[PDB]
């Protein structure tokens, strides 16, 4: 098995580099079709490209479906999207404290088909191989500083990304007494993304969005009383998760229930959790000159 996952990993990378070359070519290909459509002149080189014309007549239509939005692009994710209710586990670092294990409990309760594990004295690549041995679709290590959370690692198997991200401004459930708070409403919530506009933005949106069970596509707007909201300004992914009650069609009444994160994500390593041979897809670049000022996301 481990063979066939590793062989699929390297295969996926090989198709990616091929996609780079053929994408640079297809940049020249796409210029033809609309030029045929509008009759406007083109650059006579691209005109007098022979292999372009032959391969064109063979392979227009996949670009047509790309324009249509029909097809599902290659990535880590889009193999089985709205099929497997994505199992998600959580486990902290080596020796958790009380508040930490309660907050990991809560975030198990925030993502709705999440199971929790306790880690004990157990080895990191064997945790990875064991989750791979149960065919998961997530893993989330959450670390602590002194009875407060630090860093979430939204990693997504079989070989996708690890978003390692520091959390800031977190306060838990278990400070507010059990009379005032209630036991959590575990339903398959909705998901709302506010402000993501760069292709890296939508990449992070994808790896968040596949942490959620596929909402049943019949009456998505009306049913469901539970929503989760990610929103970003100054690269800062901030989440608030609210159970609403809807007193009217002109007024809806919220109830803050899930915790308050504002995570800043500092790496998307295109390689799974431990794999220190990492393909660094992006990072928070401090320390450079205008990387403090300018904005990704």
């Amino acid at each position: 098995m481990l063979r066939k996952q590793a062989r699929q990993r390297r295969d996926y990378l090989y198709r990616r580099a091929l996609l780079l070359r053929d994408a640079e070519i297809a940049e020249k290909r796409a210029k033809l079709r609309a030029a045929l459509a509008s009759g406007k002149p083109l650059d006579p080189k691209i005109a007098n490209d022979k292999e372009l014309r032959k391969d064109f007549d063979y392979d227009v239509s996949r670009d047509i479906a790309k324009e249509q939005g029909e097809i599902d692009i290659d990535d880590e994710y889009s193999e089985l999207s709205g099929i497997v209710d994505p199992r998600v586990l959580v486990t902290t670092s080596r020796d958790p404290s009380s508040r930490l294990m309660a907050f990991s409990k809560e975030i198990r309760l925030m993502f709705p088909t999440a199971i929790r594990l306790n880690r004990g004295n157990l080895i990191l690549p064997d945790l990875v191989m064991s989750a791979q041995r149960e065919r998961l679709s997530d893993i989330i290590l959450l670390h602590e500083h002194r009875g407060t959370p630090t860093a979430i690692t939204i990693s997504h198997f079989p070989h996708g990304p690890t978003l390692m991200a520091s959390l800031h401004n977190v306060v838990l459930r278990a400070d507010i007494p059990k009379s005032i708070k209630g036991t959590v409403s575990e339903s398959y919530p909705h998901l709302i993304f506010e402000g993501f506009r760069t292709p890296l933005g939508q990449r992070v949106v994808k790896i968040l969005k596949h942490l959620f069970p596929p909402r049943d596509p019949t009456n998505n707007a009306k049913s469901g009383n539970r929503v989760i909201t990610f929103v970003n300004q100054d690269d800062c992914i901030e989440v608030r998760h609210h159970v609403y009650v809807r007193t009217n069609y002109n007024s809806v009444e919220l109830s803050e229930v899930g915790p308050r994160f504002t995570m800043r994500p500092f790496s998307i390593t295109m390689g799974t959790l431990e794999n220190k041979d990492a393909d660094v897809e992006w990072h928070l670049s401090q320390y450079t000159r205008t990387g403090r000022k300018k904005n990704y996301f």
């Binding site: 063979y58 227009v60 996949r62 029909e70």
Partner: protein, 119 residues
């Protein structure tokens, strides 16, 4: 290619051929009819015969050792044995190739890495 580009059944046949070949082991992509047009290759079928795939997967060194080895039969494929050195190997099976129940090739490996355990 002859079919008009707006045809739904044409796109379905496109994805059909490309998915079946990408899971076959000939091709490399899953996106280009052009790649079908002048990439599909009798050398690609040759590259998917079971001698050369155990060479690339680094069982033997070159295709002489591989082919002689298979003639005297040392390579199981999942569960069966192998006699007939053109067992085509799909991308799904190129992991479950391995050596047979107990052969001296297995014991060459294990005698070298000093995990030789006669049991």
């Amino acid at each position: 290619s002859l079919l008009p580009p707006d045809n739904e059944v044409r796109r379905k046949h496109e994805t059909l051929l490309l998915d079946k070949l990408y899971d076959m082991g000939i091709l490399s992509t899953k996106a280009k009819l052009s790649a079908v047009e002048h990439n599909v290759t009798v050398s690609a079928f040759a590259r998917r015969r079971l001698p050369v795939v155990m060479t690339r997967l680094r069982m033997a060194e070159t295709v002489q050792a591989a082919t002689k080895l298979i003639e005297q039969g040392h390579v199981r494929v999942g569960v069966e044995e192998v006699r007939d050195p053109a067992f085509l190997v799909t991308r799904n099976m190129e992991d479950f190739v391995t050596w047979t129940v107990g052969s001296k090739i297995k014991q060459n490996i294990m005698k070298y890495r000093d995990k030789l355990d006669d049991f």
